[PDB]
From a paper:
Here we sought structural insights into the human immune recognition of fHbp, a key antigen in the two licensed MenB vaccines. In summary, we present here the crystal structures of an fHbp-specific human Fab in free and antigen-bound states, elicited by vaccination.
By an iterative streak-seeding approach, we subsequently obtained better diffracting crystals (belonging to space group P21) and ultimately determined the structure via molecular replacement with a resolution of 2.2 Å (I/σI = 0.98, CC½ = 0.26 in the highest resolution shell). Two Fab/fHbp complexes were present in the asymmetric unit and were essentially identical, exhibiting a root mean square deviation (rmsd) of 0.5 Å across all alpha carbon atoms. Overall, 17 fHbp residues are involved in a curved interface. The buried surface area on fHbp is 800 Å2, which is typical for Fab/antigen complexes. Numerous H-bonds, salt bridges, water-dependent contacts, and VDW interactions are widely distributed across the binding interface and contribute collectively to the very strong recognition of fHbp. In addition, several other striking contacts are established via salt bridges between Asp161 on fHbp and Arg54 on the heavy chain (upper left), and Lys185 on fHbp and Asp55/Asp57 on the heavy chain (lower left), and, via hydrogen bonds between Asn190 on fHbp and Gln101 on VH CDR3 (upper right). In short, of the total 17 fHbp epitope residues that make contact with the Fab, 12 are absolutely conserved, and a further 4 are conserved moderately (≥66%), in fHbp var1.1, var2.16, and var3.45. We found that several epitope residues are absolutely conserved (5 of 17 residues) throughout the entire fHbp antigenic repertoire, and an additional 5 residues have extremely high (≥99%) prevalence.
Numbering used by the authors:
A (entry chain H): 1 to 140, 142 to 222
B (entry chain A): 14 to 82, 89 to 115, 123 to 255
C (entry chain L): 1 to 212
Amino acid sequence: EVQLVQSGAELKKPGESLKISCKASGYTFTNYWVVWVRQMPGEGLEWMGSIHPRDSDARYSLSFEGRVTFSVDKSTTTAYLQWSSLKVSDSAIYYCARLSQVSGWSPWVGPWGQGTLVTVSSASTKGPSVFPLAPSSKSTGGTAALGCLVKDYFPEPVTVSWNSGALTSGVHTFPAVLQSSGLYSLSSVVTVPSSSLGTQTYICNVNHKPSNTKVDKKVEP
Amino acid sequence: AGLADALTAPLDHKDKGLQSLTLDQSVRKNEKLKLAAQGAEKTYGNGDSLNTGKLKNDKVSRFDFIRQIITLESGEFQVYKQSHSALTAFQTEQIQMVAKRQFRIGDIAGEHTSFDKLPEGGRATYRGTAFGSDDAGGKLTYTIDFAAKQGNGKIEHLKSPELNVDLAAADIKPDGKRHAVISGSVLYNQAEKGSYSLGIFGGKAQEVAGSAEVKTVNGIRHIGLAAKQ
Amino acid sequence: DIVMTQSPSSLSASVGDRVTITCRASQSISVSLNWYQQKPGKAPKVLIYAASRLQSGIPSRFSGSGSGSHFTLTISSLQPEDFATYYCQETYSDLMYTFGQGTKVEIKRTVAAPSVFIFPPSDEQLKSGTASVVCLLNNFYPREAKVQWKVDNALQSGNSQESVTEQDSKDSTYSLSSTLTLSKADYEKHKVYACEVTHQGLSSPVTKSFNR
Ligand SMILES: [Cl-]
């Protein structure tokens, strides 16, 4: 299959430089434009520009023309986006994607990389603590709620899965909230049949790449 | 690359064909064409033959050129070579001298397949190159159904996406010399954006070669076409 | 340089409704226009290209029309899974394929009361010196809900934070967590910890609480 796999989430101080990468595979690297798209959380897609791996023809939109540099490594079929001097306002998600086309028709963007979250701030990274949100003992033949509190981390993001991905139905992982301390916190919860509490194992899998923190918490009654 | 060889060595039947191309469109009767590459240089020569035998097949070979009548034009001279066909193109850099860029196909030559000796049935798939100004990376695919005496195809992966057009279904026909030729429309988003013309080459129709004129937002763009099998 | 603008920027419609999003260009772009769908936490996915060409794998309830400077995305029967924001994009120019600002599509459904749960602080967290009390409102509609915290009937203020999920792709509901944050010492000084929920789906307010 065609894949575009971007490097992990990043934390840098304002004024620092940063190179993020986009590994293309499953197709001929030099037959397709590589495209870069910025997206502020909760906002729209922004076309930053593109580069053609065949001869490294790079194009920049007026808003990014001097601040970023596109490059490519053909031997590793990897595209690169590089800032020389970051600003807080550069905090956002950045996508690479292939420019696809059926002959005889206007092109489109896709497949896409999974995106890279870039956080620009002087604050240092901190891994989360993970606490059980244990199911009530006075649970209703009805439904029961349980979850995990993922508390005090920086920067975003954290991922949460349950039972290594086997449990998706009824899962709610809330958007992180910035606490007054300046650290992030978030809960992930799931509602399950209360009859399964005694007999079914529930494990939240927490991952905070930026701090290399990975936790698997078994949540019990 | 053997570019210098092509400029200094005589024709040698042991070389991989197409062994020779007769320059005609590339240099009018009253003009001279000088080609330079890899330290060598040779002047042509309307009717003179270019030693394509020394060049690599299925690649664009490139020379510096000057066209004289007094210099009229200079730039890069491109040659794309197949076994039974070959074509030339001029990337103009200088005209009367001032800087000016233009792209143009020159000769399309080789062993024309007779329209009257085509295979009687079966389908053939041709795969090769589409090359335009500053871009020899295009992939051409073309299919001829010989029972139906029809062909169609597509251009892919040129950097300029509106050149990656559909080469619409077209009839095989005889030209004045009974050569098998195909002239059709170029389609983009189902609109006609120009035209293409292909000649069939080789005794067993092993190849197609020709060109396309494609209308773009920024003007007409000329493309060289060549594919095989 | 070519500017694309969508309308509306936000819309809400019932399942099975006909939904229409319009896209406009600052200049004629013929039919070189794409439509993308983007769901929460995922990259966008192309739905249509060349203004009306349905990508394979995409349901036929999606269709695109128009040309020149005016284009339309139509969803013939809005489905729950169609919650997303939708983008147009011109692919007319010499690369530089700019997007519309996006249109968020939400589902209108009947009011649904939340089911409520309260979670006391774990012993583990208490060890580290802080107490987080979590109250969950599960699968309700509309999004508007009111949570108030009481400790020994003392109304809390200024010490809780709320978070809401995006609309669910199956039942089109929302969920909300309210986290009351207290020092360990303050937490150990009180007995009755209560979460009181007010929501249109509830005829009268619902309270969940515990002792410790
Ligand atoms: Cl944009």
